[PDB]
Amino acid sequence: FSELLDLVGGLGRFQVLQTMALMVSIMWLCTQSMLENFSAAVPSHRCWAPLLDNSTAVSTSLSPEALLAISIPPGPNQRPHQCRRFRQPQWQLLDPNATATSWSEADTEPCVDGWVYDRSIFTSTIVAKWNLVCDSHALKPMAQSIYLAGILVGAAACGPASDRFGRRLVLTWSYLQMAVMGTAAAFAPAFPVYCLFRFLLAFAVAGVMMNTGTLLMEWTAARARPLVMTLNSLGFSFGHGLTAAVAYGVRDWTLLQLVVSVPFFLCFLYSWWLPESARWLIIKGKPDQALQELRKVARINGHKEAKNLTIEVLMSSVKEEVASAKEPRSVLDLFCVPGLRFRTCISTLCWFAFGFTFFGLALDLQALGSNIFLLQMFIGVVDIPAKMGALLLLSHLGRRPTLAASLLLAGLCILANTLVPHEMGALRSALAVLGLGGVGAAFTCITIYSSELFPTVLRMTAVGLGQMAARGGAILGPLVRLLGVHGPWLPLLVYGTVPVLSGLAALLLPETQSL
Ligand SMILES: *[C@@H]1O[C@H](CO)[C@@H](O)[C@H](O)[C@H]1NC(C)=O
Ligand SMILES: O=C(O)c1cnccn1
Numbered sequence: 001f002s003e004l005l006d007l008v009g010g011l012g013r014f015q016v017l018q019t020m021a022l023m024v025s026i027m028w029l030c031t032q033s034m035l036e037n038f039s040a041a042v043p044s045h046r047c048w049a050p051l052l053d054n055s056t057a058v059s060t061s062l063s064p065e066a067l068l069a070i071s072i073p074p075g076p077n078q079r080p081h082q083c084r085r086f087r088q089p090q091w092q093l094l095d096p097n098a099t100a101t102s103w104s105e106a107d108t109e110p111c112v113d114g115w116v117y118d119r120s121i122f123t124s125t126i127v128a129k130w131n132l133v134c135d136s137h138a139l140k141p142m143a144q145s146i147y148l149a150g151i152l153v154g155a156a157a158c159g160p161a162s163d164r165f166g167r168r169l170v171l172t173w174s175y176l177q178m179a180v181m182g183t184a185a186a187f188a189p190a191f192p193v194y195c196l197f198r199f200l201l202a203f204a205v206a207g208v209m210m211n212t213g214t215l216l217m218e219w220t221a222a223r224a225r226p227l228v229m230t231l232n233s234l235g236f237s238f239g240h241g242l243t244a245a246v247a248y249g250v251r252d253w254t255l256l257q258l259v260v261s262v263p264f265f266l267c268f269l270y271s272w273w274l275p276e277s278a279r280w281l282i283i284k285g286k287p288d289q290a291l292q293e294l295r296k297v298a299r300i301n302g303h304k305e306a307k308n309l310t311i312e313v314l315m316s317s318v319k320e321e322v323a324s325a326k327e328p329r330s331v332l333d334l335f336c337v338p339g340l341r342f343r344t345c346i347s348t349l350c351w352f353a354f355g356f357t358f359f360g361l362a363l364d365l366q367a368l369g370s371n372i373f374l375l376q377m378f379i380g381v382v383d384i385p386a387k388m389g390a391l392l393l394l395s396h397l398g399r400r401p402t403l404a405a406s407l408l409l410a411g412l413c414i415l416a417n418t419l420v421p422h423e424m425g426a427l428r429s430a431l432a433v434l435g436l437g438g439v440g441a442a443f444t445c446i447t448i449y450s451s452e453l454f455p456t457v458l459r460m461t462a463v464g465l466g467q468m469a470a471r472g473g474a475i476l477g478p479l480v481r482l483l484g485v486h487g488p489w490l491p492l493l494v495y496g497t498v499p500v501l502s503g504l505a506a507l508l509l510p511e512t513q514s515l
Helices: 002-008 013-037 064-071 126-130 139-165 167-186 191-217 222-249 253-261 263-270 278-283 287-301 304-308 311-317 319-326 332-336 340-361 372-381 383-396 399-419 425-450 459-486 489-506
Strands: 045-047 084-086 108-110 115-117
Touching (some): 002 287, 002 311, 013 139, 013 167, 013 222, 013 253, 013 263, 013 287, 013 372, 126 139, 126 191, 139 167, 139 191, 139 459, 167 253, 191 222, 222 253, 222 372, 222 383, 222 425, 253 263, 278 319, 287 304, 332 340, 332 459, 340 399, 340 425, 340 459, 383 399, 399 425, 425 459, 425 489, 459 489
Antiparallel strands (some): 045 115
């Protein structure tokens, strides 16, 4: 194909504008995923209780601390309990002579009158709106899992649709569905409905990701292609910083979700001015429409020689693309061939670890340190040099040691974060930030390495299985957080162990650098 791009302009004004336009959309798309660090933050809470919260009652001389100690019992954090209150005010507990056996469990009851939440950091969150606390606490990671399952189902449905209807049509309607479903999720009347709309938003997020990447690859001349995928990968890195920047200003979840959704109406509107993939159009037997797209890009780039193209030249020079329809293949072909079984297993395990680890950790920053705005910023700011350093080492050291060292770095940081005591919040923050940086570098490595481990007709299928395994692992990410009832060390032990085991597995892969 590339000779037509050479004649039309292989990296010109059009590709520059298109790359910028698609990067910006990927930034906002990243915010949609990272949002529920802030949209679903857990403010500290207690039961509603008469002496504290009944402002219509008769006045009293006692200070707030005394009233609180008189009304809500102590809990595991050496602080007021978040799910229980005294059945009647424990005036006896005010005296300095008091002891812990002055009351018993029979003196307590659950939050019959509901909960009171701290409004100092966030004005509202879904947790505060629908009381996703105490016996309902599991519903938050469930909501996150339903979103990520939406991405899996959407990626599965995108393939057939992308090949049947085209790259740009599916991209356009995905932008529209993101705008509409995000706006609808902002105004959901009940929690099940919020889950439904987040699922339907995720279904479209998958389409935007896949077709953004594909539509760049089908319009970029090969000499510039690695750079374009690098910039595409940096879009997510800038998205983390943008999430922190937006969420620091908009402290109200409905307004925050709406604010990050509205941009996709503009993305929808400008996706009509992009061209459809010329490869796809010729492959599907529509060469006159392909000629229109090619002459349009030539007009934007300013090449005078647009007269040199004809549908005969297109059909002659793109026949080697058209011929690709001859040979279908299946995922079983990866496991039937005696040697490729081992490569497939280990490669797929690496793809899983990035998904399981990244979306396990990056969606509960509130557990990693004292300030979640700076944490969300830094898992972008560190992501940038991690990705660039990964490319450098991946060029000079080879694929195998770079992937292995990256995953082991991630795993050992996350595991060390179990041992560092809760007093040292800054060091805990730093270790978790470095862990997520290593996970990003590992994503960079495995994307490239999986494109080299396999014979060229199975290459696409191997990467496809890998990406669907990453998406499938992301679903299990948040669910593993439910193990926290046994202590916060256990979820972190799992999130740390998976990348160590897969890193040591990657050491068994064969090196693919030419020498
Ligand atoms: C709140 O205080 C008013 C004072 O008149 C009282 O009538 C009402 O029953 C109280 N309600 C609760 C739940 O304490
Ligand atoms: O590079 C990243 O951070 C990334 C890429 N695709 C999906 C999720 N995350």
